[PDB]
Structures are given as C-alpha cells and as structure tokens.
Structure 1
Amino acid sequence: ANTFLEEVRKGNLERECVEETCSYEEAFEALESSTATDVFWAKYTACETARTPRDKLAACLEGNCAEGLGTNYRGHVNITRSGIECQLWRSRYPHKPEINSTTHPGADLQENF
C-alpha cells in the first residue's frame, strides 16, 4: 500500500499482500486465479491474527496449523481426538449435517479431514 510509486513497478504478492497491509484489489490484481484468490482471502481473514510478523503470515500460508478456532487448517488429519473415524462432511451417513459442504464451501472440505 505504502511507497506510492509501487503501482508502476512490477509487484510481489509477498511485497504487497504479505510484508504490507494490502488491498484485496492489489490482491485481486495479482491473483486473478479467483479460486486461489478466495484461498488467499481466506488466508488473510484467518491470518487476521497472523498479519504480523512476516514469517507468521508465511506459516499461515502453509496452513498446517489451525488459527484460533481452526478456520484455516488445511492438513491431512482426518481423525477425531479419540481415534473415531471422521464422517464425510457432505454425506448424510450417519447424520445429515445442517453445517456441511453446501454451507461451508470455502473451508476446502476434503474427504474427512
């Protein structure tokens, strides 16, 4: 955002929307891949507490750790705290989830992760 003459130089997704509080416009401009754009947005949002420092935002981009209540987690662990198998979020077996893939598509709902 700062260093006004940045909009004439080429840019770095990391030298605009990472090491600096950025516009989703410059984010949109730099991303275009609107799926990953939503991903980066989701990042930003969850990383709202990971805005600083820089390496914290880098880790929040890695996504292996759940931020706060766990909106950002994108790992491969699909097991409950006590070893019970996780039911498919979209499937109705054995429970029909009021809160499921249709209601939360932006969390990247995997098989049972």
Structure 2
Amino acid sequence: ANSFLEEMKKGHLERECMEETCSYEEAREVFEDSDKTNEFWNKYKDGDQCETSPCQNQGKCKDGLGEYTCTCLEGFEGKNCE
C-alpha cells in the first residue's frame, strides 16, 4: 500500500487501493475527485450495499458508512421505500 515508491510512481487504481486496507485518498488520487471518495471506499472490505436496490417503487440509492439512504419520489418514502 505504502512505500518509498508505492506512493511516488504514477497513481493507478490497478496498484495501490485494492489488496491491503485502502485507508484513504488512494481511491481519490487516481481520479482527482472528492465526489465518490466516501461513496465507494466503504466497498473495499465488506462488499457493496446498493447493488440490491433496496428502494422499490423507482427509488434511488445512496451509500453511507453503515446505513443506506433510499430516495423515493413525491408521495413515496420509506427506509427502503417501504
């Protein structure tokens, strides 16, 4: 993950953030983008969480570090649009 050269060479996602802990930034360095910085790094150890689409009734998903947000449309709500 870290070394004298692991973080001195070119930043590639096919290198640093994959086979250790991927603590931080090494998922942001590759892209230079703090938008999905903490909406994807939660999916390094335990697997994805929105791939099941818990929200039904045409509701979008949002991943948080422990709980899932389900955006349901006007007049629709719920923990999973439930």
Give the TM-score normalised by the residue count of structure 1.
Answer: 0.41
- Mark the structure with the bigger radius of gyration: 1
Q: Which amino acid aligns with 2:46?
A: T
CA RMSD after TM alignment: 3.3
Indicate the structure with greater strand content: 2
2:77 to 67, 80, 97: 97
Structure 1 residues 22 and 72, CA, compared in 2 at 3 Å: closer, same or farther? Answer: same
> What is the TM-score when the length of structure 2 is the normalising length?
0.51
Percent identity, aligned pairs only, is 46
CA–CA distance in structure 1, aligned partners of residues 43 and 18 of structure 2:
11
Q: Which amino acid aligns with 1:49?
A: D
Q: Which has the higher contact order (CA 8 A, sep 6+)?
A: 2
Q: Does 1:73 align with 2:36?
A: no
Q: Which ranges of structure 2 fall in alignment gaps of 5 or more residues?
A: 60-71
Structure 2 partner of 1:80:
none
Q: What is the count of residue pairs matched by the alignment?
A: 68
Contiguous gaps of at least 5 residues in structure 1: 51-66, 76-85, 102-113
CA offset digits 1:34-76 (Å, max 9, x no partner):
33434432432xxx235xxxxxxxxxxxxxxxx5xxx14168x
